Design a protein around this nucleic acid. Structure first.
Length: 1296
RNA sequence: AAUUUCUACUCUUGUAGAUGUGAUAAGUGGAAUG
DNA sequence: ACTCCAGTACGCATTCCACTTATCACTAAAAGATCGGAAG
DNA sequence: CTTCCGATCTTTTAGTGATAAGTGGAATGCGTACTGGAGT
C-alpha cells in the first residue's frame, strides 16, 4: 500500500538561481578605480576571438590522425543486418557491443594504442593526446608536435595574454574531452563515424547494389557523371560504394566531396539528378526504378569541422550607426550610378517608343489597376469587353487566358483611353521627384528616436516605390520585347535590386526588442573565482555569503597587491550586532574523492611498482593509514572492470569474490573516512555495516549526504564595514523583486528556494544542497530612449472596469494620448464608445519604462540541488506509478486539449466514466487571453507596416501556457489525478486552433514535464509534502520527445485523432471519406450501398439504416464494434435547454461554395426541411413509410442525387461552428440505447458542453482506456500507444 | 506600466504565474504571404 | 456541326528568420610552476 | 656573486549504476486548368 504523498524525495534535481548584485558602500568606487570590468571585457573578447584559433589545433590533429585508419567494416555490417533481420535483445546487445569495440578501435588511433600503427607513431600519438587537454596548448610542445599549424605573431601574443590564466578554458578543455571521447555520445567523433555516418553509407551501398542488379546498363551513366564531376578518379564507381572505401571518407573534405558527388554542385549534376531525370522518362526502366528506393542520402558533417555551405547565413545587421553608414554607402552607390538619369531617359523613351513591343507581368496588373483607377477591376473588365468586341463562354475564357499572359501597353491604352497614360506619366514624375528628394536627404546621426525611423521609412518607401514602379514591365523571352529597352530595364533593375534585403533588415532592426541582454563574465583577476564555497578554498576562490536580518549578501575578497593576504574574520558572540558569515564544509562525492587522496597518489603508485609491503600515509591524516597490495590492486587492475565493481560480477559471475572485494573496499573507505583530517569529525554511525550492502553505488549514495554541512557564525559589523571601506572586501547584496522595501505579496519560487535553503530545518537536515561553480556576470547599460510616466500627468490602465477584457493597443495609444492631452487628432468612434468603460489614474510616483535596462547591472548565477538526500537517478519510476495506479482504482483522470473557441480546455472525470468538472482556460487570473490574442492577431499586420515595436505572438503564446501550468498542477494536486495530454508525434491539429503550432506546444509539454519533477507550492508549509523542502516528484526526467514513449509518470500521452468528432453517448464517428464520392456513378454506388430510408409518423423524423459490411469502397478503413447504425434525420423543433433558452434542433452549418471554390462564409441549413422540399419535387408519398431510397434512385436526376449526398454529409457531420454568432456545438445524427439523440445545446452538465469539452472528455476517456488496460495487465506496463481501431472498438463497447 | 529573466498587469513605490545557468557540437527546421 | 459543362488531373511558389537536440561542469585537494629571499 | 628552498598561486585530477528494450511510423488541401460527353 502506497500513498499519493509518497511521491516525494525520489531523485535529485538540479536548478539554478539568478540574482542582481547591488554593491554596498565603496564597493563600486573601488571596482571602478581598480578597472576590473574593462579588463574582464577585454579578456572575454580575447577568449571569443581565440576559440577558433585554439579549435584549429584540435581540427588539424583530428584530420591528421583520422587519415591513418585502415579498419575493415564487415563485422559491423553483419551485426547491423543481423539486428535488422532478427530484432531481439540478443542481436541488439551484440550490435551495441560491436559498435562499442569499433568506437574503441578507432579511438585507439586518437590515444595511440592501436596495433595497426608503428610503435614510434603510437608513442607520438599518445604523447600528443596527453598534450591536447592540458595547459601546453598556450605556449607548449603541442604546436611543436604538429608542425603543420602556422601561428602568426598576433595570435601568439593573444595566446600569451592568458598566461597563468589557463583555467578560464578549463570547462572548454573538458568540452573538447567529449568531442574526442568514445563513450557513446552525440558529440563524439567515433560515434559520428560508427553509428551515424556508417549506417548511411551502408544504406547507400545496399541501394546501389540493388539498383545495379535490378537495372543494368546504368553503371556507365554513374561513371560518366563521376568523371564529369571529376573526383575519386583513382578508383572505379563500385569501389567507391564498396566497404573498404570507408577506410577513406572519414575526414570532412572527402565527406563534402562525397556529398557533392551525390547531389552535384555551371550546374554539373550529381547522382541524385541523373536518377530523377531517369525517373521522369516514365518508361519501363523508370517504372522499375520508381518502386525501388532511388534516393541516396548525404553523409553527416564531421564534428569540429568548418562549415562549407554555411547553411543559410542568418545575417542580422548589427548597430544603428553601422546600418546608417551602410545606407550612406548604398545612397552613394545610386548617386554615382546615376539611376535617376537613366530612369528619366526610360521615361522619355516611353513616350516615343512602339508601345506594342513592351509587355507587363501577369500577377501585378491589378495593382496597376489599383493605382491608375478607383478600383482594381477596371482594367481587366475594360480589356474583357474590348476583346469581346473583336469576337462564347469558352471564347471569352481563352480570351482572358491569352489576355493576362501577354498584357500589352498599347492594347491597355486603346482599351481604356489616354487617362491611364496621363496618370502614368504623372505617377512616374512624382515618384522620381520623391526618389531624388529622398536621395538628396542626408542621413540622421542616430536611430534611437522614432522620427529618425520615420525619415528612414520615407526614404526607403520612396526608393521601393520607384522599384515597384520599375518592375511593372515584363522582360522575359516568353513574349517579344524591344532589345535596348529590355537591356536598359534589366540594368536599372539589377543595379538597385538588393534593397529588398535592406528593407527587411531595417524592419527587423525596428521590430527587434530594444534591450541589450549581453553580459560578460567577471573574474576580478581570479582563476576559478567562486568555483566552490568551501572554507579551505575561501582563500583561492574568494567568495562567501552573509545574512543580516533577512538580507543576503555576497562578499568577494580580491587579490592584494602582488601577493594576496587573507582577511580571516574572527567569529563573534551572537548577541553582538553584525553579519552572519556562512561556513561551508563539503567533501565532494566519495567515488572520486576517496581514490583522489589515497591509492592514486604519486607516492603510493611509485612505491607499489617495486614493493609489496604496505605503505603508511601520514600527512593530511590524524593517524597513519596503511595501504597494502590487496586493496591497491582492487582500484588499479589490468582488466577493465574492477573487482568491487558490479560490471565484473555481471561479466564473470563469481558472486562471492565480488562480495569479498566489495566488503574490503567498504572497510578501507570507512577507515579512510575515520582517519582523513577533513572528515575525522564526521559521524558515520548512520551507515549500515559493511557486509550489508548490495552494491557500491548504494553505499556512495548513502554516504554522500553525510559529507556536506553549512554553519553560520556572527561577524562584527565594524569589521566588515572597515573591510569594505579599505577595499579588502567587495560586498554586494543579493537582490530580486521580493527583497524590496515595498514587498507586499507572495514571493517568487526562486526566492522560496533561496529562503528555504537557509532555513534552520534545512541546516539541521540538508534537503537542498548549495552547489559551487557560481558565475558572476556584468551587463552594460543598454542605449535606450527613456520613457517614463512623469509626475503630475494622467496614466492609463490596460483593462476596463471588468478585469477580463483588455484594450487593443492601437486604440490604447490613442486613448493614452487623449487622456494626457497631447491630442493632435480627432477622437475615434470606438474610443468614444468605450470611454466610459475605461479607467485612468493620477500618477503618484515616477514609473520608468523598463528601468532594469537603463543602467549597468551585476548578476549572480548560483546552482542548487533539490531532493539531495535521494539518489541521482530514478529507478523504475513508471513501474512505481503503475503500482500506485493499480492499488488505487478510484483516481480521476484530467483530459487536456486545445480548441478553436477556447485555447485550452480541461475535463476531470471519474473511473466510472462520468464527468466531474469541465473548464475553459480562456480566462486566467481574472484576465481573458483569447481577447488579447485576437486583438494581437488583428493588429499584427498594422504593426508590421507601421515600423512599430511590439511583442510577438510566440512569446504571448508561450507566456500564456506558463499561466496554464499553475492551473494544471492546481487541479492535479486537488484531484490527486493523472493527466492525459496530446501525443503530437502521432496526430496533426487543424488550422483554426488557438495553440496550433507543434513547437510552442511541445514546449508546453516540456515545461509541464520538468515542472512536475520538482513541484513546490507557494501556499504550502515548508515542512509539509509539496513545500520547499519536500517537493512533489510526479514525473520522470525529460530526455527527448520521441524517447519518452507515452507514459512519463502521472502524465500520460495519447494519440490525437478521433477525439473531437465522436458522439459521447454512443461512440459514432465519421465513417466516410468524401474524396471518393466526386462522380455520379460513385454517388449512385454510395446510395445503393445503403440499407433503407423511411418516415415515422409517431415522432415525425426520418430514419435511415446503414451497415458497414456493405459500402466499403467510400468507407474509411476503421471498422467499429457495432454492426449497424440508425441515422436519424431529426425533425427540427423549437427545443429548450436547461436554462430555458430556445434553439432549433438538427441545425447544420456548412461552408458555402459558388461553383467549386469555398468563399469562407457559412450557410445555416435545416436538413429535414431541405429533404422534404427535395421530395416535394418528386411528389412521392413519404408518409407511407416505404423505402423511398430506390424510388429516388430509380430516376437519374443527377442534381437531386447531388443535393441528397450533400445533405447526407451535412446531417452526418458531427460538429458545427460559426464564429459570427458564437455557435459551437455537437449534434448527433443517431440515438443511444435510451432512444434520444445527443445535442450539446441542451447544456446538460452530465455531458460535454461543446466541441472542446467533447474533445477533452474523449482524451480523458482514452486515458481511462489506457489505465484500465494497465489494471487488467499484470506486467505494470502500458501498450506503448493506442490504435484508432482499438479505441473505436472500446468506446463503442462500453457505451453500447 | 516598475521584474534575476519572461509573459500579462496595476488595490499596492509594486501584483499573479512561470523561471537550469554557462560552455560546446550537430541536425537542419520553423513562420508568413499567396 | 458547334458550344456548354461538369467530372477529371497534376502538381506548390516566394520570402523571411533561429529553433531544436545532445553532451558536460556544478570541486577540494594533489601536483606542479614560480618566486622572494636565504646559504655557500 | 651564484645557487637552492619553503611559501604561494595555478592546474588538473580522481570516477560509482543504470536505464529504452520502442520509436503507431501519419495520410497536403487547394487550386487552376483539361477534356470528353451531351444539348442545340
Amino acid at each position: 500500500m502506497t500513498q499519493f504523498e509518497g511521491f516525494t524525495n525520489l531523485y535529485q534535481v538540479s536548478k539554478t538561481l539568478r540574482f542582481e548584485l547591488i554593491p554596498q558602500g565603496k564597493t563600486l568606487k573601488h571596482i571602478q578605480e581598480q578597472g576590473f570590468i574593462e579588463e574582464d571585457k577585454a579578456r572575454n573578447d580575447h577568449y571569443k576571438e581565440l576559440k577558433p584559433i585554439i579549435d584549429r589545433i584540435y581540427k588539424t590533429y583530428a584530420d591528421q590522425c583520422l587519415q591513418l585508419v585502415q579498419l575493415d567494416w564487415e563485422n559491423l555490417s553483419a551485426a547491423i543486418d543481423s539486428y535488422r533481420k532478427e530484432k531481439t535483445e540478443e542481436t541488439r546487445n551484440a550490435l551495441i557491443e560491436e559498435q562499442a569495440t569499433y568506437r574503441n578501435a578507432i579511438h585507439d588511433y586518437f590515444i595511440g594504442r592501436t596495433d595497426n600503427l608503428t610503435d614510434a607513431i603510437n608513442k607520438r600519438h599518445a604523447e600528443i593526446y596527453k598534450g591536447l587537454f592540458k595547459a601546453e596548448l598556450f605556449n607548449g610542445k603541442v604546436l611543436k608536435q604538429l608542425g603543420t599549424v602556422t601561428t602568426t605573431e598576433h595570435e601568439n601574443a593573444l595566446l600569451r595574454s592568458f598566461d597563468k590564466f589557463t583555467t578560464y578554458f578549463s570547462g572548454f578543455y573538458e568540452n573538447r574531452k567529449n568531442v574526442f571521447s568514445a563513450e557513446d555520445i552525440s558529440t563524439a567523433i567515433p560515434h559520428r563515424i560508427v553509428q551515424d555516418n556508417f549506417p548511411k553509407f551502408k544504406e547507400n551501398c545496399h541501394i546501389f547494389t540493388r539498383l545495379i542488379t535490378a537495372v543494368p546498363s546504368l553503371r556507365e551513366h554513374f561513371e560518366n557523371v563521376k568523371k564529369a564531376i571529376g573526383i575519386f578518379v583513382s578508383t572505379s564507381i563500385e569501389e567507391v560504394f564498396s566497404f573498404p572505401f570507408y577506410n577513406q571518407l572519414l575526414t570532412q573534405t572527402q565527406i563534402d566531396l562525397y556529398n557533392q558527388l551525390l547531389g552535384g554542385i555551371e550546374k554539373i549534376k550529381g547522382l541524385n539528378e541523373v536518377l530523377n531525370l531517369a525517373i521522369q522518362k516514365n518508361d519501363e526502366t523508370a517504372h522499375i526504378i520508381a518502386s525501388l528506393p532511388h534516393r541516396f542520402i548525404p553523409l553527416f558533417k564531421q564534428i569540429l569541422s568548418d562549415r562549407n555551405t554555411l547553411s543559410f547565413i542568418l545575417e542580422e545587421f548589427k548597430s544603428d550607426e553601422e546600418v546608417i553608414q551602410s545606407f550612406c554607402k548604398y545612397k552613394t552607390l545610386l548617386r554615382n550610378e546615376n539611376v535617376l538619369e537613366t530612369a528619366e531617359a526610360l521615361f522619355n523613351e516611353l513616350n516615343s517608343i512602339d508601345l506594342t513591343h513592351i509587355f507587363i507581368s501577369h500577377k501585378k496588373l491589378e495593382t496597376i489597376s489599383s493605382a491608375l483607377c478607383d478600383h482594381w477591376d477596371t482594367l481587366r473588365n475594360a480589356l474583357y469587353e474590348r476583346r469581346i468586341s473583336e469576337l462564347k463562354s469558352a471564347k471569352e475564357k481563352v480570351q482572358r487566358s491569352l489576355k493576362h499572359e501577354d498584357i500589352n501597353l498599347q492594347e491597355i491604352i486603346s482599351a481604356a483611353g489616354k487617362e491611364l497614360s496621363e496618370a502614368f506619366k504623372q505617377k512616374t514624375s512624382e515618384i522620381l521627384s520623391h526618389a531624388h528628394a529622398a536621395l538628396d536627404q542626408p542621413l540622421p546621426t542616430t536611430l534611437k528616436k522614432q522620427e529618425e525611423k520615420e525619415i528612414l521609412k520615407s526614404q526607403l518607401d520612396s526608393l521601393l516605390g520607384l522599384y515597384h514602379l520599375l518592375d511593372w514591365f515584363a522582360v522575359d523571352e516568353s513574349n517579344e520585347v524591344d532589345p535596348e529597352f529590355s537591356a536598359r530595364l534589366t540594368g536599372i533593375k539589377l543595379e538597385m535590386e538588393p534593397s529588398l534585403s535592406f528593407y527587411n533588415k531595417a524592419r527587423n532592426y525596428a521590430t527587434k526588442k530594444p534591450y541589450s541582454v549581453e553580459k560578460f563574465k567577471l573574474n576580478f583577476q581570479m582563476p576559478t573565482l567562486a568555483s566552490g564555497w568551501d572554507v579551505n578554498k575561501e582563500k583561492n576562490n574568494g567568495a562567501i555569503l552573509f545574512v543580516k536580518n533577512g538580507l543576503y549578501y555576497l562578499g568577494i575578497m580580491p587579490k592584494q597587491k602582488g601577493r594576496y593576504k587573507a582577511l580571516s574574520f574572527e567569529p563573534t558572540e551572537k548577541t553582538s550586532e553584525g553579519f552572519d558569515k556562512m561556513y561551508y564544509d563539503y567533501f565532494p562525492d566519495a567515488a572520486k574523492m576517496i581514490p583522489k587522496c589515497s591509492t592514486q597518489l604519486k607516492a603510493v603508485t611509485a612505491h607499489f611498482q617495486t614493493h609489496t609491503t604496505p605503505i603508511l600515509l601520514s600527512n593530511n591524516f590524524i593517524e597513519p593509514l596503511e595501504i597494502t597490495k590487496e586493496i591497491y590492486d582492487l582500484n588499479n587492475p589490468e582488466k577493465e572492470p574492477k573487482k568491487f565493481q558490479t560490471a565484473y560480477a555481471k561479466k564473470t559471475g563469481d558472486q562471492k569474490g565480488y562480495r569479498e572485494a566489495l566488503c574490503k573496499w567498504i572497510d578501507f573507505t570507512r577507515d579512510f573516512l575515520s582517519k582523513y583530517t577533513k572528515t575525522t569529525s564526521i559521524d558515520l554511525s548512520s551507515l549500515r555495516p559493511s557486509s550489508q550492502y548490495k552494491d557500491l553505488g548504494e553505499y556512495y549514495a548513502e554516504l554522500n549526504p553525510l559529507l556536506y554541512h553549512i554553519s553560520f557564525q556572527r561577524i562584527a559589523e565594524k569589521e566588515i564595514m572597515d573591510a569594505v571601506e579599505t577595499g579588502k572586501l567587495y560586498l554586494f547584496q543579493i537582490y530580486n523583486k521580493d527583497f524590496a522595501k515595498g514587498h507586499h505579496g507572495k514571493p517568487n519560487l526562486h526566492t522560496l528556494y533561496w529562503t528555504g535553503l537557509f532555513s534552520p530545518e534545512n541546516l539541521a537536515k540538508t534537503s537542498i544542497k548549495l552547489n559551487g561553480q557560481a558565475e558572476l556576470f556584468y551587463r552594460p547599460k543598454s542605449r535606450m530612449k527613456r520613457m517614463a510616466h512623469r509626475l503630475g500627468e494622467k496614466m492609463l490602465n490596460k483593462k476596463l472596469k471588468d478585469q477580463k477584457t483588455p484594450i487593443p493597443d492601437t486604440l490604447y495609444q490613442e486613448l493614452y494620448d487623449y487622456v494626457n492631452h497631447r491630442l493632435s487628432h480627432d477622437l475615434s468612434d470606438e474610443a468614444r464608445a468605450l470611454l466610459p468603460n475605461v479607467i485612468t489614474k493620477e500618477v503618484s510616483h515616477e514609473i520608468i519604462k523598463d528601468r532594469r535596462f537603463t543602467s549597468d547591472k551585476f548578476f549572480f548565477h548560483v546552482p542548487i540541488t533539490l531532493n539531495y538526500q535521494a539518489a541521482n537517478s530514478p529507478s523504475k519510476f513508471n513501474q512505481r506509478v503503475n503500482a500506485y495506479l493499480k492499488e488505487h482504482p478510484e483516481t480521476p483522470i484530467i483530459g487536456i486539449d486545445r480548441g478553436e473557441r477556447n485555447l485550452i480546455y480541461i475535463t476531470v472525470i471519474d473511473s466510472t466514466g462520468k464527468i466531474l468538472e469541465q473548464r475553459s482556460l480562456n480566462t486566467i487570473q481574472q484576465f481573458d487571453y483569447q481577447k488579447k490574442l485576437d486583438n494581437r492577431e488583428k493588429e499584427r499586420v498594422a504593426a508590421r507596416q507601421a515600423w512599430s515595436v511590439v511583442g510577438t505572438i510566440k512569446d504571448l503564446k508561450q507566456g500564456y501556457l506558463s499561466q496554464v501550468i499553475h492551473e494544471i498542477v492546481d487541479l492535479m494536486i486537488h484531484y490527486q489525478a493523472v493527466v492525459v495530454l496530446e501525443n503530437l508525434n502521432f496526430g496533426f491539429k487543424s488550422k483554426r486552433t488557438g495553440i496550433a503550432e507543434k513547437a510552442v506546444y511541445q514546449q508546453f509539454e516540456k515545461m509541464l514535464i520538468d515542472k512536475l519533477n520538482c513541484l513546490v507550492l507557494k501556499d504550502y508549509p515548508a515542512e509539509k509534502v509539496g513545500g520547499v523542502l519536500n517537493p512533489y516528484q510526479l514525473t520522470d526526467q525529460f530526455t527527448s520527445f520521441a524517447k519518452m514513449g507515452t507514459q512519463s509518470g502521472f502524465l500520460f500521452y495519447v494519440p490525437a485523432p478521433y477525439t473531437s468528432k465522436i458522439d459521447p453517448l454512443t461512440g459514432f464517428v465519421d465513417p466516410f471519406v468524401w474524396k471518393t464520392i466526386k462522380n455520379h456513378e460513385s454517388r449512385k454506388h454510395f446510395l445503393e450501398g445503403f440499407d433503407f430510408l423511411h418516415y415515422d409518423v409517431k415522432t415525425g423524423d426520418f430514419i435511415l439504416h446503414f451497415k458497414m459490411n456493405r459500402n466499403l469502397s467510400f468507407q474509411r478503413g476503421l471498422p467499429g464494434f457495432m454492426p449497424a447504425w440508425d441515422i436519424v434525420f431529426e425533425k427540427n423543433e423549437t427545443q429548450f435547454d436547461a436554462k430555458g433558452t430556445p434553439f432549433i434542433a438538427g441545425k447544420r452549418i456548412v461552408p458555402v461554395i459558388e461553383n467549386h471554390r469555398f468563399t469562407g462564409r457559412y450557410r445555416d441549413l435545416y436538413p429535414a426541411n431541405e429533404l422534404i422540399a427535395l421530395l416535394e419535387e418528386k411528389g412521392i408519398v413519404f408518409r407511407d413509410g416505404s423505402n423511398i431510397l430506390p424510388k429516388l434512385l430509380e430516376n437519374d436526376d443527377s442534381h437531386a442525387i447531388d443535393t441528397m449526398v450533400a445533405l447526407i454529409r451535412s446531417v452526418l457531420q458531427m460538429r458545427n461552428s460559426n464564429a459570427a454568432t458564437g455557435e459551437d456545438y455537437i449534434n448527433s445524427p443517431v440515438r443511444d440505447l435510451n432512444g434520444v439523440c445527443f445535442d450539446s445545446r441542451f447544456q446538460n452538465p452530465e455531458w460535454p458542453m461543446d466541441a472542446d469539452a467533447n474533445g477533452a472528455y474523449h482524451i480523458a476517456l482514452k486515458g481511462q482506456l489506457l489505465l484500465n488496460h494497465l489494471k487488467e495487465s499484470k506486467d505494470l506496463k502500458l501498450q506503448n500507444g493506442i490504435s484508432n481501431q482499438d479505441w473505436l472498438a472500446y468506446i463503442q463497447e462500453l457505451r453500447n
